[PDB]
Amino acid sequence: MAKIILRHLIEGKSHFQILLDVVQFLPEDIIIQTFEGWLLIKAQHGTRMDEHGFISRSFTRQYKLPDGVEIKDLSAVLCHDGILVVEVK
Amino acid sequence: XXXXXXXXXXXXXXXXXXXXXXXXXXXXXXXSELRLSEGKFQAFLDVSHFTPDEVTVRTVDNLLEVSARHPQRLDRHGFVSREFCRTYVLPADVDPWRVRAALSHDGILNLEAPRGGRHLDTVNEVYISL
Amino acid sequence: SEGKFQAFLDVSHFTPDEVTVRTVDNLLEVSARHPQRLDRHGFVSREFCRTYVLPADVDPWRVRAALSHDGILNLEAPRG
């Protein structure tokens, strides 16, 4: 008799936004630290199996604030899709 | 993309460093990605982000280590600094030395090394003590 | 519990992409068969096929199959 199939599972002014592409860099590896005003983040992926050959990484990026900005109003978020955004809401 | 991986395409803004793997299988005898065939052990990498002087390749024993690391630049969003130390596992047949590498204008290192240096043997099976 | 006979199997070990069930007669099967996962200690391959004996009171048709984000696949079938 016939086969059964499974289912389930579901800017301009007054704001500043910085969405980056976090590849296979896990949130336990990625760290978003804000100093005086410049928004900083570091990927740092340890020496993992990486299928074919064993690979490692490190991606530290610092983004400059647009003068009138306080490092407290900014609230970052690393989306499940991969894109990690640091914006003020 | 959604929970069942049903995607809905989006770009608009800027992005950061790194890349995605190429076509490769498992359960072999040897271990952008590898393209090692019977006689010629070739490789490929997207080293486009890094300058030729920043790239350093060495064969520490049987592992062709491809080290990078580049300090802060202009990019497009701001000051971005990257680093990567991708190592490849070559079989016992392939010579640890006599490894060629070519960086393209596009920014791609196309590593190569021929097979034929050792006999390459072994299986062995141990017994349980209980 | 009464009315609908449901079976709970933790498919957390397997991926939602590599999931198979198939009814076939009165009995209800469930196949998985993974490729070699990357893991932390080393490469690992796993294959498991659990056959759930559905009663004569429960139909082959209208057999609901759903898996939670936690990895709990519930195979239910109303009786009658």
Residue numbers in the entry:
A (entry chain Q): 1 to 10, 66 to 144
B (entry chain A): 20 to 50, 65 to 155, 157 to 164
C (entry chain D): 70 to 149
Text from the published report:
sHsps are found in all forms of life and typically are dynamic oligomers that have ATP-independent roles in cellular protein homeostasis, protecting the proteome from uncontrolled aggregation especially during environmental stress. The sequences of sHsps from all kingdoms of life contain a conserved, well-structured “α-crystallin domain” (ACD), flanked by a variable, and generally longer N-terminal region and a shorter more conserved C-terminal region. Here we have investigated HspB2 and HspB3, which co-assemble into a tetramer with a 3:1 ratio of constituent subunits. This protomer forms the building block for higher oligomer assemblies, consisting of 8–24 chains.
To compensate for its lack of C-terminal extension and to enhance its solubility, the highly negatively charged C-terminal extension of human HspB2 171-PEEEEEAAIVEP-182 was added to the C-terminus of human HspB3 (Q12988). The resulting monodisperse hetero-tetramer was crystallized and solved at a resolution of 3.9 Å, allowing the roles of both the N- and C-terminal regions to be discerned. Solving the structure was challenging due both to the limited resolution of the data and the large size of the asymmetric unit of the crystal comprising three tetramers, giving a total of twelve protein chains. The hetero-tetramer can be described as a dimer of two AP dimers, AQ heterodimer and CD homodimer. Reciprocal exchange of the C-terminal VYI motifs into partner β4/β8 pockets of HspB2 chains A and C forms the hetero-tetramer which is bisected by an approximate dyad, that does not intersect the AP dimer dyads. The symmetry is unusual, reflecting the unique stoichiometry of 3:1 for the HspB2:HspB3 chains. Whereas chains A and C form the β2-strand of their respective ACDs, chains D and Q do not, leaving their β3-strand unmasked along the sides of the groove, while increasing the space in the shared grooves. The density is interpreted as the N-terminal region of chain C filling the CD dimer groove, and the N-terminal region of chain A filling the AQ dimer groove. The map has been interpreted as having 3-KIILR7 from HspB3 (chain Q) filling the pockets of chain D. A 3:1 ratio would then be the minimal size for a stable oligomer.
